[PDB]
C-alpha cells in the first residue's frame, strides 16, 4: 500500500515543474545568455565593453547600464 503511492507523488511532482513552472524553459534560456549561445548578444555585449579599453568602466552607472 506504500509503493503504489510513491510513484504517483513523484510523477506528479516532476510534472508540476514542467507544465506549470517551465523548468524546461529556464535551462534553454540561461544558455541563451550565460553560455552566449544567442548571437547578436555576446557580439553586442563584448563589443561594447571592448570599445573602452580603471576608475571608469567600474561604477554601476556604465556596466549596470550596458
Amino acid at each position: 500500500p506504500l509503493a503504489a503511492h510513491i510513484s504517483l507523488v513523484n510523477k506528479a511532482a516532476v510534472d508540476y515543474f514542467f507544465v506549470e513552472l517551465h523548468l524546461e524553459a529556464h535551462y534553454e534560456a540561461l544558455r541563451h545568455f550565460l553560455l552566449m549561445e544567442d548571437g547578436e548578444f555576446a557580439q553586442s555585449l563584448s563589443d561594447l565593453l571592448f570599445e573602452k579599453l580603471p576608475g571608469e568602466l567600474l561604477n554601476p552607472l556604465v556596466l549596470n547600464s550596458v
Binding site: L2, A3, I6, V9, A13
Partner: protein
C-alpha cells in the same frame, strides 16, 4: 491480541506524521525520507 491492541494504538500518532507528506529493508528507508519532503514542499506552493 494484547500486544497487537497495544501496537495498533502505539503507532496511532506516528501514522499522522506519515499522513502529512502524503531492521526494515533499506530499499524503502531512504525513499520515505524523500516521499515526505516533496509533500511538505508542495504545501508551501
Amino acid at each position: 491480541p494484547v500486544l497487537l491492541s497495544l501496537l495498533k494504538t502505539s503507532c496511532e500518532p506516528y501514522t499522522r506524521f506519515i499522513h502529512d507528506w502524503v531492521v526494515f529493508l533499506k530499499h524503502i528507508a531512504h525513499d520515505i525520507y524523500v516521499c515526505g519532503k516533496t509533500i511538505n514542499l508542495l504545501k508551501l506552493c
